[PDB]
């Protein structure tokens, strides 16, 4: 299928290289850029919830360290977070793609960061909100109705799992940022290789 | 420069092969050697940290044994020298914490940054000279901490090399996605 005898003018070569550089920017770099931007915004809003949590935790019980946790306030904050990003996917930025295109980018970004979701007849790679869903299930398992008092043992157990899901989102965001950095360098190197064919 | 000049696909293949080879030589093989030299150095520092069992003149014997061993073992380049700006781009790429641009003459190298072992010596002489169970262990905390920073310098370098390999692997994937 390789044909070494195929001839191309230098002018045709310049235009084909230009066309390919544009395609790779539109279909690869800009895709990564929006995915990073979307996850970054989600984790920024989660971090505001984190700041708000300090107001939802306060000394409780009688003498000593018990913690009163405003569970319904935290619960609705995380529910509103999921609701804000239901329609802000990692890919694509606008409209939808086919299932194969979505699965392709699901694989590239990672099945723990994204999740393929059907919008209309088309598909998107949504932000995978499993860490938030885990926090909400864990909150519902604290029981109580609205507000719960947690002794040291139960506060430490709840907080350890909550922080681990926060850490997971941080790890996810770090991996996405590193992948976008690498994609930028893959693009730079492709430009250099293609330009070398003109040398 | 003449847009009408014709070029064959097999000529294009040879130019792309040339550029792939250049990237391996100029980028990947540079990272690999830097990982190698900082690894061998930190592995030799693990020598003296495992021999802590045995006092202070014992330690300097083997601690600037180390600095001496690696003064002509730069991170980059492997052989000969480069210009100052070439050394500065690779120091930028590898990190000012782990390397230091150094003028031999004939040109410049990016030597291994030996400040963790300098820092350890400053604290070594600082104390005096026997240490009680209280401030022997404060010292060992400072010593163990510089081990940790060299340890972490190595880790960060290995990660950058891993990412550089990924970049190369993906470049080759793109270029071979038709064949
Ligand atoms: C292998 C990738 C595939 C990227 C894509 O999906 O287009 C592409 C990217 C740029 C492509 C090349 C562009 C210049 C050349 C165009 C000529 O007509 C003959 C083949 C060349 C050398 C192309 C070969 C190859 O098709 C390339 C290297
Ligand atoms: C980009 C051209 C042409 C592709 C096309 O015309 O569609 C292809 C054709 C021959 C290809 C090479 C063949 C040998 C090598 C195979 C390796 O697994 C990747 C690097 C090499 C050096 C290839 C790199 C490159 O992928 C080439 C040069």
Author numbering:
A (entry chain A): 122 to 320
B (entry chain B): 123 to 176, 191 to 265, 270 to 319
Task: Reproduce, without paraphrasing, sentences from the article in which this PDB structure was first reported.
Like many Gram-negative pathogens, Shigella rely on their type three secretion system (T3SS) to inject effector proteins into eukaryotic host cells, driving both cellular invasion and evasion of host immune responses. Studies in Shigella have demonstrated that bile salts found in the small intestine (e.g., deoxycholate (DOC)) interact directly with the injectisome tip complex protein invasion plasmid antigen D (IpaD) to support interaction with the hydrophobic translocator protein IpaB and its stable recruitment to the maturing tip complex. In Shigella, IpaD resides at the extracellular tip of the injectisome where it functions as a “gatekeeper” that prevents unwanted protein secretion (leakage) through the injectisome prior to requisite activation events. Here, we uncover critical mechanistic details of the Shigella-specific DOC signaling process by describing the role of a π-helix secondary structure element within the T3SS tip protein invasion plasmid antigen D (IpaD).
X-ray crystal structures of DOC-bound IpaDWT and DOC-bound IpaDΔQ148 were critical for resolving this apparent conflict by providing the first molecular insight into the role of IpaD’s π-helix in the DOC-mediated Shigella virulence enhancement pathway. More specifically, comparing these structures shows that eliminating the π-helix does not eliminate DOC binding, but instead causes the single binding site for DOC to migrate approximately 10 Å, now docking in the cleft between the two central helices where the elimination of the π-helix occurred. A closer look at the side chains located within 4.5 Å of the bound DOCs shows that while some polar and charged side chains such as lysine 137 and serine 141 in the native binding site and aspartate 144 and serine 141 in the modified site of the π-helix deletion construct are in the vicinity of the DOC binding sites, they are oriented away from the bound DOC and do not appear to contribute to binding through electrostatic interactions. Instead, both DOC interactions are driven nearly exclusively through hydrophobic interactions. Furthermore, the π-helix backbone atoms in the WT structure also occlude the distal end of the mutant DOC binding site.
